[PDB]
Design a protein around this ligand. Structure first.
Ligand SMILES: Nc1ccn([C@@H]2O[C@H](COP(=O)(O)OP(=O)(O)OP(=O)(O)O)[C@@H](O)[C@H]2O)c(=O)n1
Ligand SMILES: [Mg+2]
Ligand SMILES: [Mg+2]
Ligand SMILES: [Zn+2]
Lengths: 49, 49, 1362
DNA sequence: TCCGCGTCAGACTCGTAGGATTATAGCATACGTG
DNA sequence: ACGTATGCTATAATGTGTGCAGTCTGACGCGG
């Protein structure tokens, strides 16, 4: 996987909600990971590594 | 006028393993794969024919 | 050495000391130059014994002269090295340490017993917070955690009167103080008060644990280890390599971590070091102990040299790579050799080529034996050299022993029992094994580079077993289906086809012969073709009423070839069988016929002769593969070019904006699907009868002798499906995702694909071959899962003495009868006298096997429905009777007692799934579905008979159906079901109920790519809870502005309109609701998700109009890939996410109370005075409409049926009928043939345990779930003694759980969850007395089944006799 | 008692192939056996 | 005497971190 930024979405983490939760992820060549992700209530979250 | 580019040769889709198979065009991709995989396993003979 | 049981209990610190022969006090392995044990080290000989057989270290006492002498200097005994893997050790832990398997292996166990959580215990262990052991002053109560702040408060204030400590020390004292006697009574009292579900569950489990703990004799303190056992050094080896290197197991390394830290703790306790340091040392010590027992569990597994984790103890008992699966149930075996196999077309069925140099090494001890007899070898090393030199006369001795000696031939993988068959070896000079063509089918052995393992049966019993059971001749029919697996294919079929098949005049037409020998005379003389119609005088031999054979001589108009084949045909079968053109399907009946008539001998001969003549005449033909043979039909370019413009038409309509993307997607598939079948049939219509050019006078029409066609028509290789790609059209390929490419492959293999046509072909090819590799594990894992639960089933009794059986009906699905009742009820014992229509005389006895000839009289009498003695209806405790099972389909007559069915059943079920996941996964690569079920056409005249149907007449004048599971029968003259169809919801019927129809009439018509919502009442449409943006969306066009509304589901829906249900409410002209005729339901159809609506608000409607159109996208070839999961889920008994509701007890329905649409039901039975209430959703529609005569388990809702819901209500024979139908439906879709009795085996095993409801004479009581056989044996003594009956209610169990339920813990740990199984078995102190096969195969004893059944029962009378 | 999200359990069976680590001072009396 | 083992040195120095992060369906077990 090529470093940079990448936008994905688990087409149904919770098929309970069945909500397409969108997420972004900064992939470096060296360094820590930087992810942003929504949730069932569309609250933006950040999960380093 | 809508065409902007064109495939150079007719062999660029395939690899080296597959470019040696004659009449590939008349062969199923499942048997073509096995054929190119076995062509790599071909022990050279006493007299090169 | 010969025992009865194996027990598992908790290792007491005192017990661990009993096995240990010393205490390892140092990590020192060996000295560096002197490669010898160190002083009380990990390889110490003073603890684990001497190195060599009878040798001390320093070398003072040597061999047996000093039998059991203990040396002075080194202090080492002089016994065998035997003891170095037997003798154990121990370590005296400075501070006590907790066991990870009684802490982390959930349930907590140590926490479950204390009534204490995990966090609480761990924070005590890692020294974060203290815990109260016992507070004299009732200020602080037990098991109350105090932070480092809260401990200090109680110390100066209260103090002394409260005893609280920290670390593994504390929790041990907590376990040592707790009273199992008192806290058992306390929990029983709290249970009598007001009991719920969760409260009673928790209490009963703890209650049983507490009683189990007292009766197991285990003490809860042994959960903490004061003593740590050491593994024998030979079982954790330090051995030197050939290269001067050494090598050690990871245990030794993990051991050195434990001993170092433990000794460092002894040192720090000597120094009286500050507690902060002592804490770290204790945390470390526990980290090391926990890492030794189970490394990767509590935290990060301690990684070692190659950055990989150290292999711990538990790991060698854990899973595949553990001792069980890898080094015990499976073994590498002596007298075993494997080699590339090649064909053996000269061999008979009971023969196989075995290389000389192979059989040489294999039979090495049998040469040395026969050599000493003749006196050629005086000793064995003399015989060894005689063999080595390979001298001439040794070959002749080897050749002597091998004669009349069977060998086992295995091919991987071993799916079913036929994966090994025995033969009589024939020595051949060459490194290749030569195998018999007909049994190639059983192995699935292709001579394309296959290897087969050889095994020599040593013991005379093994020679008899191999000749009796495992011989190729004794194994013909599959155990799965009563059908021959020993059936020609490939060349053999083609040769017979060439022979029998006829042609016009030819050389010598219409000639006249004395015998089938004159036909061979004239053909080989060159004055007749095998395809010439000539009258021949053949004398056929027909069996009479007795055993005597009747002879009949007559003139038969066949062909020269057919006549010659009669020579192979034994005398006892009719000639009409070889009078047809023989193909693979026809040939399979010849051998079956031959078998059911004459017997075994005649068939083996026949089978071989068929094979020989097949190959020979196949080669005489000269059958080839020219490219002029792959004929494309005349008008392919004419069909496609105009079938392309057809698709181009809809493409322009879509961009205009009328036909939706999903409707177009289904509509374009139907065009291509018609064109594909159009090209396929034009091909064979031009290829089958290409021979329109004959002779005689002028012309005649005849079958085509095109090489490729013959090779497909005969059923030799390929089919109409393959030829389509060759001369016709390749067809539509499948993506690796599962979706089908919109653009298929136009070209074939003759004309040649362009560059993309091949690129496109790849997508379907790679995904088809990806599911050959990856999907195979699910199917093979199923075989494993099935087997374990069905290990124990063996035929025990002869007659169970039970009346119970299983009523079976004919599988008549999809017009043409799918499976005849005769075939369904074949070789199954009846449970009830089943006579002929006129009830006035019996014809079939109750307890009698149904042979094919008895089933023929069922056809004359036309049996309606039959109660067959089933497996599940068996009363035999621990096994089944031969009557319940019936015939062994593999054999052909009633099953032997002692034959192990369960394993035969499991194999039969997993083979087809594992075999249909590789055969058309490597040779296929494209979808071939045709789900255009638009309309039912009835074929024979009949009266229309609908059932479970509730229809309503529409504006047009057409009977529209408003019921989901509507069935359509076809009733004949006398009044019996011939054809049967599934008419779906919102289908338009041509004629209603009771009306006559003619043959070839469209009785029903509908749209397949749509699921309409149809009304029952007329008036206007109202929008309720259909707010734009929240629940639905809107999209308009141009000039006028026709908008469509699309209903969003919880996936595409906001949190605003989640509890809002969208529905199209019906109203009248005034604006009020319209009642549905004869119900208090205002008309309201709830629309589900992705429901497309064309009518907007305020539109007039009649009854029968379509309100909305729910899309029905399902164009993914289920095959075996997406059909096995559904099988697994059924067996594993996983309730669906939309189970259908059923009535519990019979009586009067009475609708009750409601909650914002959530419907209740206050049912008040006629006999039962106490009401029963159950809740129901709003959006879900029912089937009954209130106030009704409902019985036990009527259908109230529609959807998937939960297997637990079926047995709970409608008994055993209902859940058995469900699984059997449901499973077979998936396999019948694939053409997998399995007898229902094999599934019934697994079903029976899934009904093993049962929950008790009512107190009995034994201490059963409520909440216990015991096996069904044990509780019924208690009922045997109860009906004799009286006392209190133990009422019950059988429960259904999934495969994975039914395996872990069996009293045998050895069988459970050998399966999976091995970490948990052992811990639960240790705490219970359970003893396994071994009944299953896994149990006795492990210990390497006689299997309590099959050959060993006669032996094991002779030991059971040793126990009975005192 | 029910919902949410944490850990923990599986993932077919047999055959073949070949290799490499870093570093722990420095010197002077104390402890164990021919 | 020979090998192993124990012992002491005196500038000041006083809280670690390291490393793989598209598995997945299914099933409980503690809080909230
Ligand atoms: N990964 C594999 C490959 C092969 N096999 C075994 O080898 C058999 C034959 O594989 P193959 O020769 O590739 O398939 P065929 O059906 O003989 O097809 P082909 O015409 O391509 O030879 C399979 O049925 C199976 O028993 C297997 O179990 N696992
Ligand atoms: Mg093969
Ligand atoms: Mg093959
Ligand atoms: Zn000694």
């Amino acid at each position: 996987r090529s470093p940079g930024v990448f936008f994905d979405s688990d087409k149904g983490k919770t098929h309970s909600s069945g909500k397409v939760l969108y997420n972004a992820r900064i992939i470096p060549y060296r360094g820590s990971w930087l992810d942003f992700e929504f949730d069932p209530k569309d609250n933006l979250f950040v999960r380093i590594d | 006028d809508q065409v902007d580019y064109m495939d150079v040769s007719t062999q660029q889709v395939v690899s080296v393993g597959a470019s040696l198979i004659p009449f590939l065009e008349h062969d199923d991709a499942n048997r073509a794969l096995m054929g190119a995989n076995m062509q790599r396993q071909a022990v050279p003979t006493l007299r090169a024919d | 050495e010969e025992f009865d049981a194996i027990k598992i209990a908790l290792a007491s610190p005192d017990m661990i000391r009993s096995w240990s022969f010393g205490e390892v006090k140092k990590p020192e392995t060996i000295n560096y130059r002197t490669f010898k044990p160190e002083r009380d080290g990990l390889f110490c000989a003073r603890i684990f014994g001497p190195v060599k057989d009878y040798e001390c270290l320093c070398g003072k006492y040597k061999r047996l002269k000093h039998r059991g002498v203990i040396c002075e200097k080194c202090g080492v005994e002089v016994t065998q090295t035997k003891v170095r893997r037997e003798r154990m050790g121990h370590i005296e832990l400075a501070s006590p340490t907790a066991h990870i398997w009684f802490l982390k292996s959930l349930p907590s166990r140590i926490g479950l017993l204390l009534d204490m959580p995990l966090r609480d215990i761990e924070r005590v262990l890692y020294f974060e917070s203290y815990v109260v052991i016992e507070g004299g002053m009732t200020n602080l109560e037990r098991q109350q955690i105090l932070t480092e702040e809260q401990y200090l408060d109680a110390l100066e204030e209260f103090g002394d009167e409260f005893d609280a400590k920290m670390g593994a020390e504390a929790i041990q004292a907590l376990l040592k103080s707790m009273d199992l006697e008192q806290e058992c009574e306390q929990l029983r009292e709290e249970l009598n008060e007001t009991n719920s579900e969760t409260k009673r569950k928790k209490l009963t489990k703890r209650i049983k644990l507490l009683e189990a703990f007292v009766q197991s004799g285990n003490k809860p303190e042994w959960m903490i280890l004061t003593v740590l056992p050491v593994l024998p050094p030979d079982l954790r080896p330090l051995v030197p390599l050939d290269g001067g290197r050494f090598a050690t197991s990871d245990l030794n390394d993990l051991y050195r971590r434990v001993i170092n830290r433990n000794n460092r703790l002894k040192r720090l306790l000597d120094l009286a070091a500050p507690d902060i340091i002592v804490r770290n040392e204790k945390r470390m010590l526990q980290e090391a102990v926990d890492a030794l027992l189970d490394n990767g569990r509590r935290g990060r597994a301690i990684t070692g040299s190659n950055k990989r984790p150290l292999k711990s103890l538990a790991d060698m008992i854990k899973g595949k790579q553990g001792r069980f699966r890898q080094n015990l149930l499976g073994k590498r075996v002596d007298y075993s050799g494997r080699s590339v196999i090649t064909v053996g077309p000269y061999l008979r069925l009971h023969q196989c080529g075995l290389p000389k140099k192979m059989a040489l090494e294999l039979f090495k001890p049998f040469i040395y034996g026969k050599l000493e007899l003749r006196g050629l070898a005086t000793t064995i090393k003399a015989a060894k050299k005689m063999v080595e030199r390979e001298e001439a006369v040794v070959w002749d001795i080897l050749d002597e022993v091998i004669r009349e000696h069977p060998v086992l031939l295995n091919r991987a993988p071993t799916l079913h029992r036929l994966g090994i068959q025995a033969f009589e070896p024939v020595l051949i000079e060459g490194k290749a094994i030569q195998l018999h063509p007909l049994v190639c089918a059983a192995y699935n052995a292709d001579f394309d580079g296959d290897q087969m393992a050889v095994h020599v049966p040593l013991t005379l019993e093994a020679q008899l077993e191999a000749r009796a059971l495992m011989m190729s001749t004794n194994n013909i029919l599959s155990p799965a289906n009563g059908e021959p697996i020993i059936v020609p294919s490939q060349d053999v079929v083609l040769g017979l086809y060439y022979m029998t098949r006829d042609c016009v005049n030819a050389k010598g037409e219409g000639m006249v012969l004395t015998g089938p020998k004159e036909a061979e005379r004239l053909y080989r003389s060159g004055l007749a073709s095998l395809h010439a119609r000539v009258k021949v005088r053949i004398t056929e031999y027909e069996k009479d009423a007795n055993g005597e054979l009747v002879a009949k001589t007559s003139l038969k108009d066949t062909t020269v070839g057919r006549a010659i084949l009669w020579m192979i045909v034994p005398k006892g079968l009719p000639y009409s069988i070889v009078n047809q053109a023989l193909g693979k399907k026809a040939i399979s009946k010849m051998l079956n016929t031959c078998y059911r008539i004459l017997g075994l001998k005649p068939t083996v001969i026949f089978a071989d002769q068929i094979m020989y003549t097949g190959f020979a005449y196949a080669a005489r033909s000269g059958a080839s593969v020219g490219i002029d043979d792959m004929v494309i039909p005349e008008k392919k370019h004419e069909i496609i070019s105009e079938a392309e413009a057809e698709v181009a038409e809809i493409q322009e309509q879509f961009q205009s904006g009328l036909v939706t993307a999903g409707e177009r997607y289904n509509k374009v598939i139907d065009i291509w699907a018609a064109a594909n079948d159009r090209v396929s049939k034009a091909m064979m219509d031009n290829l089958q009868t290409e021979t329109v050019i004959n002779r005689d006078g002028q012309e005649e029409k005849q079958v085509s002798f095109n090489s490729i066609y013959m090779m497909a028509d005969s059923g030799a290789r390929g089919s109409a499906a393959q030829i389509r790609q060759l001369a016709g059209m390749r067809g539509l390929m499948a993506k690796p995702d599962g979706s089908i490419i919109e653009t298929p492959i136009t070209a074939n293999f003759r004309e040649g694909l362009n560059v993309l046509q091949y690129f496109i072909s790849t997508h379907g090819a790679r995904k088809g071959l990806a599911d050959t590799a990856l999907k195979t594990a699910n199917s093979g894992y199923l075989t494993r899962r099935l087997v374990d639960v069905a290990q124990d089933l063996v035929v025990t009794e002869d007659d169970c003495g039970t009346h119970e059986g299983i009523m079976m009906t004919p599988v008549i699905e999809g017009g043409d009868v799918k499976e005849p009742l005769r075939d369904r009820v074949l070789g199954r014992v009846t449970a009830e006298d089943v006579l002929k229509p006129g009830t006035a005389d019996i014809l079939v006895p109750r307890n009698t096997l149904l042979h094919e000839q008895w089933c023929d009289l069922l056809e004359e009498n036309s049996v309606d429905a039959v109660k067959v003695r089933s497996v599940v209806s068996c009363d035999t405790d621990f096994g089944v009777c031969a009557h319940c099972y019936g015939r062994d389909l593999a054999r052909g007559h009633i099953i032997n007692k002692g034959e192990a069915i369960g394993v035969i059943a499991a194999q039969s079920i997993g083979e087809p799934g594992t075999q249909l996941t590789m055969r058309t996964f490597h040779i296929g690569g494209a979808a071939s579905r045709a789900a255009a079920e638009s309309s039912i056409q009835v074929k024979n005249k009949g009266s229309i008979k609908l059932s479970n149907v509730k229809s309503v007449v529409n504006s047009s004048g057409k009977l529209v159906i408003t019921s989901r599971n509507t069935e359509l029968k076809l009733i004949d003259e006398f009044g019996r079901t011939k054809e049967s169809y599934k008419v779906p919801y919102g289908a338009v019927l041509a004629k209603g109920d009771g009306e006559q129809v003619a043959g070839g009439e469209t009785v029903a018509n509908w749209d397949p790519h749509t699921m309409p919502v149809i009304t029952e009442v007329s008036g206007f449409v109202r929008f309720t809870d259909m707010i734009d943006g929240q629940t639905i969306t809107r999209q308009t066009d141009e000039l006028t502005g026709l908008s469509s509304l699309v209903v969003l589901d919880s996936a595409e829906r906001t949190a605003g309109g989640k509890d809002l249900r969208p529905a199209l409410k019906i109203v009248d002209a005034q604006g009020n609701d319209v009642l549905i005729p004869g119900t208090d339901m205002p008309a309201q159809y709830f629309l589900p998700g992705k429901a497309i609506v064309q009518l907007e608000d305020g539109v007039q409607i009649s009854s029968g109009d379509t309100l909305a159109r729910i899309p029905q996208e399902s164009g993914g070839t289920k095959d075996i890939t997406g059909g096995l999961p559904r099988v697994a889920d059924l067996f594993e008994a996983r309730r669906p996410k939309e189970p259908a509701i059923l009535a519990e007890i019979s009586g009067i329905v009475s609708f009750g109370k409601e909650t914002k649409g959530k419907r209740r039901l206050v049912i008040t039975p006629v006999d039962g005075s106490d009401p029963y209430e159950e809740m129901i959703p709003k959006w879900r529609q029912l089937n009954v409409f209130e106030g009704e005569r409902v019985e036990r388990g009527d259908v109230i809702s529609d959807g998937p049926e939960a297997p637990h819901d079926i047995l709970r209500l409608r008994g055993v024979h209902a859940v058995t009928r469900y699984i059997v139908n449901e499973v077979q439906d998936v396999y019948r879709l694939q053409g997998v043939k399995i007898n229902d009795k094999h599934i019934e085996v697994i079903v029976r095993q899934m009904l093993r345990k049962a929950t008790i409801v009512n107190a009995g004479s034994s201490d059963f009581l409520e909440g216990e779930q015991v096996e069904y056989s044990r509780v019924k044996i208690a009922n045997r003594e109860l009906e004799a003694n009286g006392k209190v009956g133990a009422t019950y209610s059988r429960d259904l169990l999934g495969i994975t759980k039914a395996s872990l339920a069996t009293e045998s813990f050895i069988s459970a740990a050998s399966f999976q969850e091995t970490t948990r199984v052992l811990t639960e078995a240790a705490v219970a102190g359970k003893r396994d007395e071994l009944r299953g096969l896994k149990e006795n195969v492990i210990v390497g004893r006689l299997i309590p089944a099959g050959t060993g059944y006669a032996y094991h029962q002779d030991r059971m009378r040793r126990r009975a006799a005192g």
